[model samples]
Target: IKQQKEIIEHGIELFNKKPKRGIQFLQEQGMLGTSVEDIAQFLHQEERLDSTQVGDFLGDSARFNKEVMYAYVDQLEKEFVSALRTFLEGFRLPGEAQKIDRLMEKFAARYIECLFASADTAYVLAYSIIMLTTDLPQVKNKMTKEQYIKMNRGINDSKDLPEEYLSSIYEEIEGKKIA
Candidate 1:
């Protein structure tokens, strides 16, 4: 558990401090277009539309699978944090400490949202990894039938997965061709 926690912490720190690394990783994997800001702006724009429209767009041909979409969003979130960190790194304007704190708070909220999205993607990917790894008998005997079935369904229904499953799905789909 300690090792797991440390890994998680390291991931979070990388995400918060140098998100571009994560973004570049995604881009290299052929998962995204547009900068982080563009993603945030696009999501913001999507939020402005009615619920029906949002659903329609998500279900449209233009839509990627839920896992694919989350991977892109996760990459964007990391990039946004990198951008903010970059902004703060060279910040030299004079201002009241309290005012600076307030500004950071606003930025932090946005950053948190991005982190949340990224973390979600990680979880989904992890689950998928588990399924793939356990498919062999050496690992299969250790997993319950129910668990196997659940993972099987997870991979198949990944496009419509919930936000909570995003991270694991992201990991699972990292190397495969997009359908």
Candidate 2:
């Protein structure tokens, strides 16, 4: 009987060769006491497993060892929290406080969505988050209030200019001075 890490590594490759044999091998290796620690160690190997390999491994793990898969998902949830905290801590501009709050709300909503997402859906969400984190600051710096108001006029006042609420809302929101 070999150590559990090697067992999982061998089991995953065996799964790549033949799914049935993989489960049988794990069973033979006695996986009744397996934990997420073992799986996590196996997952963090020097050369990470490719997406297909991870997908198949997760499928097998979900079927054969439900607790480890659930624990791994919980572990990823902790990672998302850590990522959010890092994002918040990295940005402390007084002028951008409201923007940060709105971004945080959006991210929190997406995090909730991720709680129910499959791995592929999580990948897409991660991509969108990366884009938002990278692109929003550039977009904000590119547009001035006058230019934004002019753009808004074009979109809303092709024939007439009604009183707009955006600047008013912005004034009201930023008027509060917090010490």
Best by lDDT: 2
Give the per-residue lDDT digits (tens) of candidate 1, residues 21-85.
43344345444345434433333332332333222222223323232223323432344323433
lDDT of 2 by residue, 1-179 (tens): 57534455676677557644654576577751344655533433323334344434433423444443333343334555245434333223223334333333434454566422333333333333343334333353633446444544432223212335434423432333111
- The lowest-lDDT stretch of 10 consecutive residues in candidate 2 is 170-179
Question: Which candidate has the top score in TM-score?
Answer: 2
TM-score of 1: 0.19
lDDT of 1 at 56: 27
TM-score of each model, paired residue for residue: 0.19, 0.31
Residue runs of model 2 more than 4 Å from their true location after superposition: 1-9, 31-50, 57-68, 77-127, 130-179
Tell me the lDDT of model 1 at 82: 35
What candidate 1 gets wrong by more than 4 Å, as runs, is: 1-76, 79-81, 89-95, 115-179
